[PDB]
Swiss-Prot record:
Signal peptide: none annotated. This is Type II restriction enzyme MspI. It is an enzyme of class 3 (hydrolase). GO terms for molecular function: DNA binding; type II site-specific deoxyribonuclease activity. Keywords: Endonuclease, Hydrolase, Nuclease, Restriction system.
Amino acid sequence: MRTELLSKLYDDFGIDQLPHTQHGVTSDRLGKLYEKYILDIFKDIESLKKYNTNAFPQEKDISSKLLKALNLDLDNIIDVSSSDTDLGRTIAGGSPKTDATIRFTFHNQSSRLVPLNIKHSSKKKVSIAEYDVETICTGVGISDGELKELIRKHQNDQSAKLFTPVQKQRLTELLEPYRERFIRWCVTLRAEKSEGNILHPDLLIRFQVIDREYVDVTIKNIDDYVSDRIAEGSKARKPGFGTGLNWTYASGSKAKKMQFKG
DNA sequence: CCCCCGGGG
DNA sequence: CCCCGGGGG
């Protein structure tokens, strides 16, 4: 629904002045618009308490989902602030996946930095990242060998079509031990658990947007997201060789490079 | 040219 | 799962 706040933002981002033939710019504006949405909802304590009441059904849904994903109670929160994250530096794997942060201050004067990753999409799964096989292996903790070569095969072919059923099963098998580290690294840029580090996202916010309009929002903390993907990857088909991620290629440049949807 | 944000069939 | 595109640095 185009609530008071969302209307204000669609107007601010001039989303309606964009011709329904300008998909490119419309996607950038939306992506930026929906980051603002989260930022505004958590702009400060006044905003948070305001948007968490039943007077704002939608914002309340969003904020509840966020707080629930962090297992925080609105009553324990004394102050809040939010901002766009822009560190200006890369790390092992490239730029940090943190798009913005939210800082909660509780009663005892302690606080919680919550780096976020926010995307918008009309689909269930969307691109989460692209990497060269070497970076991935380095980040996940996979050394030269059978596993790396099978992955590099995927990279060069830009899919698994040239693989044999034996090789697909084989890849799924060798990867089984690295599943979680793999998933967590793809989306956070770190194989192990993290919390409050502005360099690695704690929550993954996915806005389901169809025909330019808000539909719903999903907010997962990393542990849950990983579980979901692990489960999804345990099915008979074994999506993403067990990772629950969609392996494909980055059409981005000339060098063969892998892309992961999740 | 490369990376990040996306999608269709 | 396989095949791709727009925008901006």
